[PDB]
XYZ file of N, CA, C and O in Angstrom:
624
model
N 14.387 -20.264 12.325
C 14.300 -19.712 10.969
C 12.859 -19.600 10.481
O 11.915 -19.815 11.242
N 12.697 -19.261 9.206
C 11.371 -19.121 8.616
C 10.679 -17.857 9.115
O 10.468 -16.911 8.355
N 10.328 -17.848 10.397
C 9.660 -16.700 10.998
C 10.433 -15.415 10.719
O 9.843 -14.351 10.528
N 11.757 -15.520 10.698
C 12.613 -14.366 10.442
C 12.379 -13.816 9.039
O 12.476 -12.610 8.812
N 12.069 -14.707 8.103
C 11.821 -14.308 6.722
C 10.577 -13.431 6.624
O 10.584 -12.395 5.958
N 9.508 -13.853 7.292
C 8.255 -13.108 7.281
C 8.408 -11.775 8.007
O 7.973 -10.733 7.516
N 9.031 -11.815 9.182
C 9.244 -10.611 9.975
C 10.139 -9.619 9.239
O 9.742 -8.483 8.981
N 11.347 -10.057 8.903
C 12.297 -9.209 8.194
C 11.678 -8.633 6.925
O 11.773 -7.433 6.667
N 11.046 -9.496 6.136
C 10.413 -9.071 4.893
C 9.274 -8.095 5.167
O 9.301 -6.951 4.715
N 8.274 -8.556 5.912
C 7.126 -7.722 6.248
C 7.569 -6.341 6.716
O 7.041 -5.322 6.267
N 8.541 -6.311 7.621
C 9.056 -5.053 8.150
C 9.603 -4.175 7.030
O 9.155 -3.045 6.838
N 10.574 -4.704 6.291
C 11.179 -3.968 5.187
C 10.114 -3.363 4.280
O 10.183 -2.186 3.922
N 9.127 -4.173 3.912
C 8.046 -3.717 3.045
C 7.338 -2.508 3.649
O 7.328 -1.425 3.064
N 6.748 -2.701 4.825
C 6.047 -1.617 5.489
C 6.920 -0.393 5.680
O 6.521 0.722 5.341
N 8.115 -0.598 6.224
C 9.046 0.499 6.461
C 9.183 1.374 5.218
O 8.821 2.550 5.233
N 9.708 0.791 4.145
C 9.895 1.518 2.895
C 8.578 2.124 2.417
O 8.559 3.197 1.814
N 7.480 1.429 2.691
C 6.159 1.895 2.287
C 5.839 3.243 2.924
O 5.734 4.259 2.237
N 5.685 3.244 4.244
C 5.378 4.466 4.978
C 6.351 5.583 4.617
O 5.944 6.705 4.317
N 7.643 5.267 4.647
C 8.677 6.243 4.322
C 8.491 6.780 2.906
O 8.711 7.963 2.647
N 8.088 5.901 1.994
C 7.872 6.287 0.606
C 6.778 7.343 0.493
O 7.021 8.456 0.024
N 5.572 6.987 0.924
C 4.440 7.905 0.869
C 4.684 9.123 1.755
O 4.166 10.209 1.490
N 5.474 8.936 2.805
C 5.787 10.020 3.729
C 6.730 11.031 3.086
O 6.494 12.238 3.139
N 7.798 10.530 2.475
C 8.776 11.390 1.817
C 8.209 11.972 0.526
O 8.646 13.026 0.065
N 7.231 11.281 -0.049
C 6.602 11.730 -1.286
C 5.596 12.843 -1.010
O 5.531 13.830 -1.742
N 4.812 12.677 0.050
C 3.811 13.668 0.423
C 4.463 14.995 0.797
O 4.023 16.058 0.362
N 5.516 14.925 1.605
C 6.212 16.128 2.024
C 7.071 15.902 3.252
O 7.539 14.790 3.497
N 7.281 16.961 4.027
C 8.091 16.876 5.237
C 9.532 16.501 4.902
O 9.815 15.986 3.821
N 10.438 16.763 5.839
C 11.849 16.455 5.643
C 12.112 14.964 5.829
O 12.222 14.216 4.858
N 12.211 14.540 7.083
C 12.461 13.138 7.399
C 13.777 12.669 6.790
O 13.875 12.468 5.579
N 14.787 12.496 7.637
C 16.100 12.055 7.181
C 16.201 10.533 7.211
O 17.146 9.951 6.677
N 15.221 9.893 7.840
C 15.197 8.439 7.939
C 16.362 7.927 8.779
O 17.349 8.626 9.007
N 16.246 6.677 9.253
C 17.281 6.044 10.077
C 18.543 5.731 9.281
O 19.539 5.268 9.837
N 18.494 5.985 7.977
C 19.635 5.728 7.106
C 20.340 4.434 7.500
O 21.520 4.439 7.850
N 19.608 3.326 7.442
C 20.162 2.024 7.795
C 20.136 1.080 6.597
O 19.507 0.023 6.641
N 20.822 1.469 5.528
C 20.879 0.656 4.318
C 21.278 -0.780 4.640
O 21.699 -1.082 5.756
N 21.140 -1.662 3.655
C 21.488 -3.066 3.833
C 21.276 -3.852 2.544
O 20.550 -3.430 1.643
N 21.924 -5.022 2.451
C 21.822 -5.892 1.274
C 20.444 -6.532 1.145
O 19.856 -6.970 2.134
N 19.934 -6.586 -0.081
C 18.626 -7.175 -0.340
C 18.583 -7.839 -1.711
O 19.012 -7.273 -2.717
N 18.055 -9.071 -1.756
C 17.943 -9.840 -2.999
C 16.907 -9.255 -3.951
O 16.355 -8.183 -3.702
N 16.646 -9.965 -5.045
C 15.676 -9.499 -6.018
C 14.248 -9.787 -5.597
O 13.327 -9.059 -5.965
N 14.065 -10.853 -4.825
C 12.738 -11.237 -4.356
C 12.118 -10.128 -3.511
O 11.025 -9.645 -3.807
N 12.823 -9.731 -2.457
C 12.343 -8.679 -1.568
C 12.006 -7.414 -2.352
O 10.877 -6.926 -2.307
N 12.994 -6.890 -3.071
C 12.802 -5.685 -3.868
C 11.607 -5.831 -4.805
O 10.873 -4.873 -5.042
N 11.417 -7.037 -5.331
C 10.312 -7.306 -6.243
C 8.970 -7.093 -5.549
O 8.133 -6.321 -6.014
N 8.772 -7.785 -4.430
C 7.533 -7.672 -3.670
C 7.288 -6.233 -3.229
O 6.231 -5.662 -3.497
N 8.273 -5.651 -2.553
C 8.166 -4.278 -2.078
C 7.722 -3.342 -3.196
O 6.775 -2.573 -3.037
N 8.414 -3.413 -4.329
C 8.090 -2.572 -5.476
C 6.640 -2.766 -5.906
O 5.898 -1.799 -6.075
N 6.244 -4.022 -6.083
C 4.882 -4.343 -6.495
C 3.860 -3.634 -5.613
O 2.897 -3.047 -6.108
N 4.076 -3.692 -4.304
C 3.174 -3.055 -3.351
C 3.205 -1.537 -3.503
O 2.171 -0.872 -3.417
N 4.395 -0.994 -3.733
C 4.560 0.445 -3.901
C 3.784 0.945 -5.115
O 2.861 1.751 -4.987
N 4.162 0.460 -6.293
C 3.501 0.855 -7.531
C 1.996 0.617 -7.444
O 1.197 1.491 -7.781
N 1.617 -0.574 -6.992
C 0.208 -0.929 -6.861
C -0.532 0.088 -5.998
O -1.447 0.763 -6.466
N -0.128 0.192 -4.736
C -0.762 1.130 -3.829
C -0.710 2.556 -4.339
O -1.741 3.218 -4.460
N 0.495 3.031 -4.638
C 0.677 4.389 -5.138
C -0.261 4.669 -6.309
O -0.987 5.662 -6.309
N -0.238 3.786 -7.302
C -1.086 3.940 -8.479
C -2.542 4.158 -8.076
O -3.139 5.187 -8.395
N -3.107 3.184 -7.373
C -4.493 3.266 -6.927
C -4.733 4.546 -6.131
O -5.693 5.272 -6.381
N -3.851 4.815 -5.173
C -3.967 6.008 -4.343
C -3.906 7.272 -5.195
O -4.391 8.329 -4.793
N -3.304 7.156 -6.374
C -3.180 8.289 -7.284
C -4.447 8.459 -8.116
O -4.829 9.578 -8.460
N -5.094 7.344 -8.436
C -6.318 7.371 -9.227
C -7.488 7.911 -8.411
O -8.025 8.978 -8.708
N -7.877 7.167 -7.381
C -8.983 7.570 -6.521
C -9.221 6.541 -5.421
O -10.143 5.727 -5.487
N -8.369 6.573 -4.385
C -8.467 5.649 -3.251
C -9.689 5.924 -2.382
O -10.033 7.078 -2.125
N -10.342 4.858 -1.932
C -11.528 4.984 -1.094
C -11.214 5.765 0.180
O -11.859 6.768 0.483
N -10.216 5.295 0.921
C -9.812 5.948 2.162
C -8.366 5.618 2.510
O -8.090 4.985 3.531
N -7.443 6.052 1.658
C -6.024 5.802 1.876
C -5.404 6.896 2.741
O -4.186 6.961 2.899
N -6.253 7.753 3.297
C -5.791 8.845 4.146
C -6.964 9.520 4.850
O -7.175 10.724 4.711
N -7.724 8.735 5.607
C -8.877 9.258 6.333
C -9.614 8.137 7.060
O -10.287 8.372 8.064
N -9.482 6.918 6.548
C -10.133 5.761 7.149
C -10.015 5.791 8.668
O -10.965 5.471 9.382
N -8.841 6.179 9.157
C -8.598 6.252 10.592
C -9.735 6.977 11.305
O -10.260 6.493 12.308
N -10.113 8.138 10.779
C -11.188 8.929 11.366
C -12.500 8.151 11.362
O -13.309 8.276 12.282
N -12.704 7.350 10.322
C -13.919 6.553 10.198
C -14.070 5.603 11.382
O -15.163 5.108 11.658
N -12.966 5.353 12.077
C -12.975 4.462 13.233
C -12.381 5.151 14.457
O -12.172 4.523 15.495
N -12.113 6.446 14.329
C -11.545 7.222 15.426
C -10.378 6.479 16.068
O -10.290 6.381 17.292
N -9.484 5.958 15.234
C -8.322 5.225 15.721
C -7.596 6.006 16.811
O -7.112 5.431 17.785
N -7.525 7.323 16.639
C -6.856 8.185 17.606
C -5.359 7.894 17.649
O -4.880 7.161 18.515
N -4.623 8.475 16.708
C -3.179 8.280 16.635
C -2.486 8.884 17.852
O -1.307 8.629 18.098
N -3.227 9.684 18.612
C -2.685 10.323 19.805
C -1.984 9.304 20.697
O -0.900 9.563 21.220
N -2.610 8.144 20.867
C -2.049 7.088 21.701
C -1.348 6.036 20.846
O -1.339 6.125 19.618
N -0.761 5.042 21.504
C -0.057 3.973 20.804
C -0.787 2.644 20.965
O -0.797 1.814 20.056
N -1.396 2.447 22.130
C -2.128 1.218 22.412
C -3.432 1.167 21.621
O -3.887 0.095 21.222
N -4.030 2.334 21.399
C -5.280 2.422 20.656
C -5.053 2.191 19.166
O -5.844 1.522 18.503
N -3.963 2.747 18.646
C -3.629 2.600 17.234
C -3.202 1.172 16.917
O -3.549 0.626 15.869
N -2.445 0.570 17.830
C -1.970 -0.796 17.647
C -3.113 -1.797 17.763
O -3.299 -2.643 16.887
N -3.876 -1.695 18.845
C -5.004 -2.591 19.072
C -6.035 -2.461 17.956
O -6.522 -3.460 17.426
N -6.365 -1.222 17.604
C -7.338 -0.962 16.549
C -6.872 -1.538 15.217
O -7.600 -2.286 14.564
N -5.655 -1.185 14.818
C -5.092 -1.666 13.562
C -5.017 -3.191 13.548
O -5.409 -3.834 12.573
N -4.510 -3.761 14.635
C -4.383 -5.210 14.750
C -5.745 -5.887 14.642
O -5.867 -6.969 14.068
N -6.767 -5.242 15.195
C -8.121 -5.780 15.156
C -8.662 -5.803 13.731
O -9.004 -6.861 13.203
N -8.739 -4.628 13.112
C -9.238 -4.514 11.748
C -8.476 -5.438 10.804
O -9.057 -6.029 9.894
N -7.171 -5.556 11.028
C -6.330 -6.411 10.200
C -6.710 -7.879 10.360
O -7.176 -8.515 9.416
N -6.507 -8.410 11.561
C -6.835 -9.799 11.823
C -8.288 -10.117 11.538
O -8.635 -11.259 11.233
N -9.144 -9.104 11.639
C -10.571 -9.281 11.391
C -10.842 -9.489 9.905
O -11.501 -10.453 9.513
N -10.332 -8.579 9.082
C -10.519 -8.663 7.639
C -9.687 -9.793 7.042
O -10.001 -10.311 5.970
N -8.624 -10.172 7.744
C -7.745 -11.241 7.284
C -8.246 -12.601 7.764
O -7.962 -13.630 7.153
N -8.994 -12.594 8.863
C -9.529 -13.827 9.429
C -10.461 -14.519 8.438
O -10.635 -15.736 8.480
N -11.056 -13.733 7.548
C -11.968 -14.270 6.544
C -11.226 -14.618 5.259
O -11.831 -14.742 4.195
N -9.910 -14.776 5.364
C -9.107 -15.109 4.202
C -7.998 -14.104 3.957
O -8.254 -12.979 3.529
N -6.763 -14.511 4.231
C -5.611 -13.638 4.039
C -5.542 -13.128 2.603
O -5.756 -11.943 2.342
N -5.244 -14.031 1.674
C -5.147 -13.673 0.264
C -4.114 -12.575 0.046
O -3.632 -11.964 0.999
N -3.777 -12.328 -1.216
C -2.801 -11.301 -1.559
C -3.457 -9.927 -1.628
O -2.896 -8.936 -1.161
N -4.650 -9.873 -2.213
C -5.363 -8.615 -2.331
C -5.487 -7.891 -1.005
O -5.104 -6.728 -0.884
N -6.027 -8.581 -0.005
C -6.203 -7.998 1.320
C -4.904 -7.372 1.815
O -4.915 -6.324 2.462
N -3.784 -8.020 1.507
C -2.477 -7.525 1.918
C -2.173 -6.175 1.277
O -1.848 -5.207 1.965
N -2.280 -6.118 -0.047
C -2.018 -4.887 -0.783
C -2.790 -3.715 -0.186
O -2.201 -2.715 0.224
N -4.112 -3.847 -0.139
C -4.966 -2.798 0.405
C -4.582 -2.478 1.846
O -4.529 -1.314 2.244
N -4.317 -3.521 2.626
C -3.938 -3.353 4.024
C -2.732 -2.430 4.155
O -2.842 -1.318 4.673
N -1.582 -2.895 3.680
C -0.354 -2.111 3.744
C -0.610 -0.666 3.327
O -0.171 0.271 3.992
N -1.323 -0.494 2.219
C -1.640 0.835 1.713
C -2.271 1.701 2.798
O -1.817 2.813 3.063
N -3.324 1.182 3.424
C -4.018 1.907 4.482
C -3.060 2.295 5.602
O -3.009 3.453 6.015
N -2.301 1.320 6.088
C -1.342 1.559 7.160
C -0.449 2.754 6.840
O -0.249 3.633 7.678
N 0.086 2.778 5.624
C 0.956 3.865 5.193
C 0.241 5.208 5.279
O 0.823 6.208 5.700
N -1.026 5.225 4.878
C -1.801 6.452 4.916
C -1.907 7.027 6.315
O -1.653 8.213 6.527
N -2.285 6.186 7.272
C -2.426 6.617 8.658
C -1.098 7.131 9.205
O -1.040 8.193 9.827
N -0.033 6.373 8.970
C 1.295 6.754 9.436
C 1.700 8.116 8.883
O 2.143 8.992 9.626
N 1.547 8.289 7.574
C 1.898 9.544 6.922
C 1.151 10.716 7.549
O 1.758 11.708 7.954
N -0.170 10.596 7.626
C -1.001 11.644 8.206
C -0.481 12.052 9.581
O -0.268 13.233 9.849
N -0.281 11.064 10.448
C 0.214 11.320 11.796
C 1.525 12.098 11.760
O 1.701 13.074 12.489
N 2.446 11.658 10.907
C 3.742 12.313 10.776
C 3.579 13.798 10.468
O 4.228 14.643 11.083
N 2.708 14.105 9.513
C 2.460 15.488 9.123
C 1.715 16.238 10.223
O 1.797 17.463 10.317
N 0.988 15.496 11.052
C 0.228 16.091 12.144
C 1.036 16.083 13.437
O 0.479 16.191 14.530
N 2.353 15.957 13.305
C 3.238 15.938 14.463
C 2.997 14.699 15.318
O 2.602 14.803 16.479
N 3.237 13.529 14.737
C 3.044 12.270 15.446
C 3.513 11.090 14.600
O 2.732 10.218 14.219
N 4.820 11.060 14.299
C 5.423 9.993 13.494
C 5.463 8.662 14.236
O 5.795 7.628 13.657
N 5.124 8.694 15.520
C 5.119 7.488 16.340
C 4.300 6.382 15.684
O 4.582 5.197 15.866
N 3.286 6.775 14.920
C 2.427 5.815 14.237
C 3.243 4.919 13.310
O 2.875 3.772 13.056
N 4.353 5.451 12.806
C 5.221 4.699 11.907
C 5.742 3.433 12.578
O 5.535 2.325 12.083
N 6.419 3.605 13.709
C 6.969 2.475 14.450
C 5.854 1.599 15.012
O 5.952 0.372 15.005
N 4.795 2.237 15.499
C 3.662 1.516 16.064
C 3.022 0.600 15.026
O 2.871 -0.602 15.252
N 2.646 1.174 13.889
C 2.021 0.409 12.815
C 2.935 -0.718 12.346
O 2.533 -1.881 12.300
N 4.171 -0.367 12.000
C 5.144 -1.349 11.539
C 5.247 -2.520 12.509
O 5.306 -3.678 12.097
N 5.269 -2.209 13.801
C 5.364 -3.236 14.832
C 4.155 -4.166 14.786
O 4.300 -5.381 14.657
N 2.964 -3.587 14.892
C 1.731 -4.363 14.862
C 1.638 -5.195 13.588
O 1.282 -6.373 13.627
N 1.959 -4.575 12.457
C 1.911 -5.258 11.169
C 2.785 -6.508 11.182
O 2.301 -7.618 10.963
N 4.075 -6.319 11.445
C 4.995 -7.442 11.485
C 4.514 -8.554 12.397
O 4.332 -9.688 11.957
N 4.312 -8.228 13.669
C 3.852 -9.209 14.645
C 2.601 -9.926 14.147
O 2.474 -11.143 14.283
N 1.678 -9.163 13.571
C 0.436 -9.723 13.054
C 0.703 -10.618 11.847
O -0.056 -11.546 11.567
N 1.788 -10.332 11.134
C 2.156 -11.110 9.957
C 2.932 -12.363 10.348
O 2.965 -13.342 9.603
N 3.554 -12.325 11.522
C 4.330 -13.458 12.012
C 3.557 -14.223 13.083
O 4.068 -15.177 13.670
N 2.324 -13.799 13.332
C 1.479 -14.443 14.332
C 0.213 -15.004 13.693
O -0.101 -16.185 13.846
N -0.512 -14.151 12.977
C -1.743 -14.562 12.316
C -1.476 -15.003 10.881
O -2.075 -15.963 10.394
N -0.573 -14.298 10.209
C -0.226 -14.618 8.828
C 1.023 -15.492 8.770
O 1.419 -15.955 7.701
N 1.638 -15.713 9.927
C 2.840 -16.536 10.007
C 2.662 -17.844 9.245
O 3.462 -18.179 8.370
N 1.609 -18.582 9.582
C 1.328 -19.855 8.931
C 1.088 -19.668 7.438
O 1.595 -20.434 6.617
N 0.315 -18.646 7.092
C 0.008 -18.358 5.695
C 1.287 -18.157 4.888
O 1.532 -18.863 3.909
N 2.097 -17.191 5.304
C 3.351 -16.896 4.619
C 4.325 -18.064 4.743
O 5.228 -18.222 3.920
N 4.135 -18.881 5.773
C 4.996 -20.035 6.002
C 4.623 -21.185 5.072
O 5.464 -22.015 4.727
N 3.356 -21.228 4.672
C 2.871 -22.278 3.783
C 3.105 -21.905 2.322
O 3.310 -22.773 1.474
N 3.070 -20.607 2.037
C 3.276 -20.119 0.678
C 4.756 -20.145 0.309
O 5.112 -20.145 -0.868
N 5.614 -20.166 1.325
C 7.045 -20.192 1.087
C 7.653 -18.804 1.060
O 8.787 -18.607 1.495
N 6.898 -17.838 0.545
C 7.387 -16.473 0.470
C 6.406 -15.543 -0.216
O 5.337 -15.970 -0.653
N 6.771 -14.270 -0.312
C 5.914 -13.276 -0.949
C 6.067 -13.317 -2.465
O 5.275 -12.723 -3.196
N 7.092 -14.023 -2.934
C 7.350 -14.140 -4.363
C 6.088 -14.541 -5.118
O 5.897 -14.162 -6.273
N 5.227 -15.308 -4.457
C 3.981 -15.759 -5.066
C 3.124 -14.571 -5.491
O 2.497 -14.591 -6.551
N 3.099 -13.536 -4.656
C 2.318 -12.340 -4.945
C 2.807 -11.657 -6.218
O 2.107 -10.828 -6.801
N 4.015 -12.011 -6.644
C 4.600 -11.433 -7.849
C 4.011 -12.075 -9.102
O 4.040 -11.489 -10.185
N 3.476 -13.281 -8.947
C 2.876 -14.002 -10.063
C 1.680 -13.239 -10.624
O 1.345 -13.370 -11.802
N 1.041 -12.444 -9.774
C -0.119 -11.659 -10.185
C 0.313 -10.399 -10.927
O 1.242 -10.430 -11.735
């Protein structure tokens, strides 16, 4: 147990995130249509990240849809996008996870995924989500395990 909370949660968050900005930006996308039961905590955190990211991205985001190029992530491949994303993540998180870093992080991930999807390469969606979760249950595992849950991020 425990680890499942971070993985399941982290995944749900990212998933809905990318899909949100993806379905909002354009394109069809019917989604995996895999509904499921969810408490108020999860929905709370997810929403917070959505409104937060969306809002900022609506005002004037630094690089919520281009940063990838700044590092030539190359969405063409999967190992390059995963390794690169995992690196920048664990790197910026290694100096302190915190809640802020998370918000900005997820936001960026969604941007790259969306772009790829529109550029005929939705693979980034599953790739990013995978790296994110694993990175959250491997590097952030202890962090989220010590905090008890993401509910704390709601206090802000």
